[PDB]
Amino acid sequence: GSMISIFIAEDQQMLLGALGSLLNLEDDMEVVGKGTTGQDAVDFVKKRQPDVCIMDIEMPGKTGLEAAEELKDTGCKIIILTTFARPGYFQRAIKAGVKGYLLKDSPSEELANAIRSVMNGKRIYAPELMEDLYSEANPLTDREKEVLELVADGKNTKEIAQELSIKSGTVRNYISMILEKLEVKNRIEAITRSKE
Amino acid sequence: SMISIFIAEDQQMLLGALGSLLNLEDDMEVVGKGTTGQDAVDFVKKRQPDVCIMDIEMPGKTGLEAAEELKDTGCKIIILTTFARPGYFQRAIKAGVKGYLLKDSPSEELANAIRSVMNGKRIYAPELMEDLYSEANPLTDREKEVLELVADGKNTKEIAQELSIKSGTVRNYISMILEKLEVKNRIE
Numbered sequence: 001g002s003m004i005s006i007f008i009a010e011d012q013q014m015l016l017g018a019l020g021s022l023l024n025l026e027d028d029m030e031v032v033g034k035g036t037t038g039q040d041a042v043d044f045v046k047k048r049q050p051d052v053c054i055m056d057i058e059m060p061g062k063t064g065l066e067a068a069e070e071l072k073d074t075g076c077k078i079i080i081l082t083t084f085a086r087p088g089y090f091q092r093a094i095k096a097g098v099k100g101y102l103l104k105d106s107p108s109e110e111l112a113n114a115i116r117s118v119m120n121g122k123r124i125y126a127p128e129l130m131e132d133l134y135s136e137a138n139p140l141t142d143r144e145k146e147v148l149e150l151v152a153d154g155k156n157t158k159e160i161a162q163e164l165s166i167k168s169g170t171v172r173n174y175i176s177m178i179l180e181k182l183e184v185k186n187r188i189e190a191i192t193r194s195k196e
Numbered sequence: 197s198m199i200s201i202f203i204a205e206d207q208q209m210l211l212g213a214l215g216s217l218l219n220l221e222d223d224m225e226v227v228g229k230g231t232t233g234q235d236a237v238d239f240v241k242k243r244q245p246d247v248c249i250m251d252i253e254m255p256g257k258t259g260l261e262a263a264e265e266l267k268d269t270g271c272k273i274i275i276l277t278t279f280a281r282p283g284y285f286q287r288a289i290k291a292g293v294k295g296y297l298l299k300d301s302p303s304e305e306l307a308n309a310i311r312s313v314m315n316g317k318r319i320y321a322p323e324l325m326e327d328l329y330s331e332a333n334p335l336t337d338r339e340k341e342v343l344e345l346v347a348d349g350k351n352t353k354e355i356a357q358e359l360s361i362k363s364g365t366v367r368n369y370i371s372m373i374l375e376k377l378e379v380k381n382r383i384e
């Protein structure tokens with residue numbers, strides 16, 4: 001009734017179960033359902049309409065971000081809880097209108113407080129995302145700077161994989177991180193320099 | 197009596213939630229928590245708990261390097277990891293760990309593994325061997341809907357209309373379907 005009804009979507013069964021127990025122990029909270037894929041979240045949320053959905057990003061079948069996009073206007077308050085502090089993930093979560101974006105490297109004893117704040121109409125982001133992403137500095141790592149150096153010289157995916165002694169899919173994965181990091185840094189710059 | 201447990205896990209969310217889960221058991225007490233292998237080495241050497249739930253991948257010092265330094269203490273080391281790598285498994289058992297568990301197993305079967313290890317048993321996740329023969333369909337429900345139309349004899353324009361999605365999305369779904377089936381076919 002007055003309790004905050006929660007659904008948890010998490011593919012790692014150990015964390016899913018431990019989060020469910022932790023949250024259920026709260027007097028004002030009830031874990032009404034648990035799932036391991038984004039489809040489990042879409043199905044539950046559409047059928048049962050819980051107040052809150054604690055959502056992992058990387059899950060099989062359908063991600064937490066695709067699930068957040070499908071549930072954009074349901075009235076369910078989506079709190080992303082992920083290992084990944086990637087700009088593309090955070091940007092995609094903001095566009096889906098998530099109420100919260102939390103990192104798995106934050107105290108467990110604070111999660112219930114984030115749920116209460118989101119129920120109070122607040123938008124809760126891990127300060128670390130802000131501390132790392134909201135910057136005009138170079139976001140690229142030393143490894144990413146080595147990949148891009150070769151790309152800028154005019155070398156193809158096969159040539160970069162040979163020069164760095166790594167797999168062809170790894171070069172493509174590194175390029176995806178670079179494009180994402182620079183696309184967010186470029187959008188941040190563009191918006192803040194146009195507001196002047 | 198009570199089984200005293202130390203948990204070494206770099207992901208603060210799991211560390212805290214595992215601690216709370218284990219502490220609910222009547223015969224168990226989480227006496228300490230750490231985020232690196234050094235925290236495990238220091239706690240275990242100073243306090244000598246019965247059991248150490250040990251993550252592998254942690255900054256500074258891994259759970260495997262920690263297990264190697266603790267090899268001659270009376271602590272029962274249980275590896276709890278995301279990684280089902282043979283290299284990790286062999287390194288652990290050579291270090292004398294009593295258990296090697298996977299994080300993708302029911303939380304409700306951790307307490308039982310701790311009790312078995314305290315009873316002198318070696319607990320290794322059956323999944324380590326079973327997941328090799330986990331010959332399952334990699335295609336999603338969405339991918340199964342795309343392929344159903346392709347097999348009927350419908351073109352890219354016809355599939356995009358029947359599913360109400362973009363033409364490039366149909367091509368993206370196909371390129372994914374080919375990749376997943378090519379790897380499943382090579383594994384076969």
Ligand code: BEF
Binds near residue numbers: 056082
């Ligand atoms: F796999 Be979840 F994005 F941490």
Ligand code: BEF
Binds near residue numbers: 254
């Ligand atoms: F980082 Be632990 F090996 F899951």
Ligand SMILES: [Mg+2]
Binds near residue numbers: 056059
């Ligand atoms: Mg996940």
Ligand SMILES: [Mg+2]
Binds near residue numbers: 205206251252253
């Ligand atoms: Mg780890």
Ligand code: NA
Binds near residue numbers: 023024026030
């Ligand atoms: Na409750």
Ligand code: NA
Binds near residue numbers: 220222
């Ligand atoms: Na207890």
